[PDB]
């Protein structure tokens, strides 16, 4: 029965990526206002969104007291030492907390959307291995499911020559 739901899965996944990038540019702008150094230091969306999410302060974001660089990354990473270096030379804007809470909502959207694309990817590889094992042996999941999304069905693809 996975002739159409997998097309919903892959096109919905592209929708998830394009929607993630939209808020991601906004949050990187916002933390560009408060602390301009780390936003140019970490181009990642999810982890940097958590880095904005846990602390909201540019004078107490360290690897120890407090631990936000020992929670996901390690303190022996070259990124974390540059967070220690950038935390001293800060010149950014001091803004209120109510403005930051809206961006905490945004980081919660980032973690949510990240969870749904992970679950969608696992369901994607799972059902692609289910309904079409041999094409997953040849050209994998993404290209084969893409070509099914071109033909619309396994039957239409089975009729093309």
């Amino acid at each position: 029965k996975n002739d159409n739901h997998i097309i919903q899965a892959i096109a919905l996944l592209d929708q998830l990526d394009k929607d993630i990038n939209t808020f991601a540019m906004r949050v990187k702008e916002w933390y560009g206002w408060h602390f301009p150094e780390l936003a140019k230091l970490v181009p990642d969306n999810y982890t940097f969104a958590k880095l904005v999410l846990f602390i909201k302060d540019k004078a107490s974001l360290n690897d120890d007291s407090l631990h936000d660089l020992a929670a996901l990354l390690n303190e022996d990473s070259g990124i974390a030492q540059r967070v220690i270096d950038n935390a001293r030379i800060s010149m950014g804007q001091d803004i209120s907390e109510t403005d930051m809470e809206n961006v905490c909502v945004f980081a919660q959207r980032v973690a949510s959307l990240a969870d749904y694309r992970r679950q969608l990817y696992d369901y994607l590889c799972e059902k692609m291995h289910t309904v079409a094992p041999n094409l997953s042996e040849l050209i994998g999941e993404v290209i084969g499911a893409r070509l099914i999304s071109h033909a619309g069905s396994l039957t239409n693809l089975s009729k093309q020559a």
Binding site: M91, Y116, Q119
Partner: protein, 382 residues
């Protein structure tokens, strides 16, 4: 003999006039709150803490003839109980011009690099305190957020169409009855399959007359049945849709406090979204207050008005005022004149909220302006 006035503490210079381009004593201040009150102290002529400590520590050999630069500090030290002989002669002095020349070399742990950075960040904060506001005068985040809210509507609509489409296989007969996407989503998020129909989850969502069509339609719909994993993806995505539907309302709640805070009279007249589209379509409040009320009435649909000016035909009399409820309440023959009154008083409320007197006072005059609008509103309907 020499008092040094700078944002790194206060120093006594005897270089121990007998001077060898060195220092006699230094008493150190360095922080943001210290240099803030020191920046207050040079303006006020105010004696600081390390000025009193510098009068207290060194005495009787380097302070009997003290030369201070300010005339204000000469009288404060002149009234000290230690009885110093203090003058303010030779302020414009090459020595006094030269104490800043060896200033990285006479202060340990400092150089010319951190002095411009500390003076820069001090200049930001004293610019915040003197101008009694922020260092950017930020209002653009409302303009960004109102651009994001329609994106929430479009993306939430997109995912609503999605879950509509790959729910229609199992139970096709719901879109003909239930068209609202939230009521579409919460039924599946509570129920799941059609074979687990109950009463309470329908009762919290729908009226009874819709619920009976839902139940009898659930009897006669014989769509597909499949494994629980796809159903888990359905409850996941439905949780996501209700989640985002709460999030856009949280965004409107964020725009509530900012719109009430920054533009109170505009909030009183048209509320939040209309004036948000006014400032957003204009670009800024300060250029819009420079724009007259004739531009304010025609704000929006620039190609239609510019087309009406090229063709010299009937001008569109509807801009962003086309969606106001008090304006939409009136008939079209009487709508444009009331919109002229509302744009006319609206320009007055923009010139209220623009010039930094109602941001600190939260607005009291647009309350009278709404009454003046409603009076003429009653009169034109007569």
């Amino acid at each position: 003999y020499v008092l040094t006035e700078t944002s790194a503490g206060y120093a006594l210079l005897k270089a121990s006039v007998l001077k060898e381009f060195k220092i006699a004593a230094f008493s150190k201040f360095n922080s943001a709150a210290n240099a803030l009150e020191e920046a207050n102290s040079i303006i006020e002529g105010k004696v600081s803490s390390q000025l009193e400590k510098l009068l207290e520590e060194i005495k009787k050999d380097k302070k009997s003839t003290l030369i201070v630069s300010e005339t204000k500090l000469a009288n404060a030290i002149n009234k000290l109980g230690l009885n110093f002989n203090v003058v303010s002669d030779a302020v414009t002095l090459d020595i006094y011009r030269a104490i800043k020349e060896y200033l990285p070399e006479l202060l340990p742990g400092m150089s010319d690099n951190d002095l411009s950075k500390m003076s820069l960040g001090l200049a930001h904060s004293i610019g915040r305190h003197k101008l009694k506001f922020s260092a950017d005068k930020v209002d653009v985040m409302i303009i960004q957020a109102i651009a994001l809210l329609d994106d929430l509507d479009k993306e939430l609509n997109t995912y609503a169409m999605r879950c509509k489409e790959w729910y229609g296989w199992h139970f096709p007969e719901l879109a003909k009855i239930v068209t609202d996407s939230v009521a579409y989503a919460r039924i599946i998020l509570t129920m799941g399959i059609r074979s687990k129909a109950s009463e309470t989850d329908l009762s919290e969502i729908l009226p009874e007359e819709i619920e009976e069509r839902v139940k009898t339609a659930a009897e006669v719909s014989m769509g597909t049945e499949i494994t629980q994993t796809d159903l888990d993806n359905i409850n996941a995505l439905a949780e996501q849709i209700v989640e985002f539907a709460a999030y856009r309302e949280q965004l409107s709640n964020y725009l509530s406090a900012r719109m009430k805070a920054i533009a109170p009279n505009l909030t009183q007249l048209v509320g939040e979204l209309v004036g948000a589209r006014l400032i957003a379509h204009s670009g800024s409040l300060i250029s819009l207050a420079k724009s007259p009320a004739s531009t304010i009435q025609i704000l929006g649909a620039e190609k239609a008005l510019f087309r009406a000016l090229k063709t010299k035909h009937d001008t569109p009399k509807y801009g962003l005022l086309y969606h106001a409820s008090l304006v939409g309440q009136a008939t079209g023959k009487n709508k444009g004149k009331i919109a002229r009154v509302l744009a006319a008083k609206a320009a007055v409320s923009l010139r209220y909220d623009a010039l930094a007197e109602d941001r600190d006072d939260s607005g009291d005059i647009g309350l009278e302006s709404r009454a003046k609008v409603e009076n003429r509103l009653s009169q034109l309907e007569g």
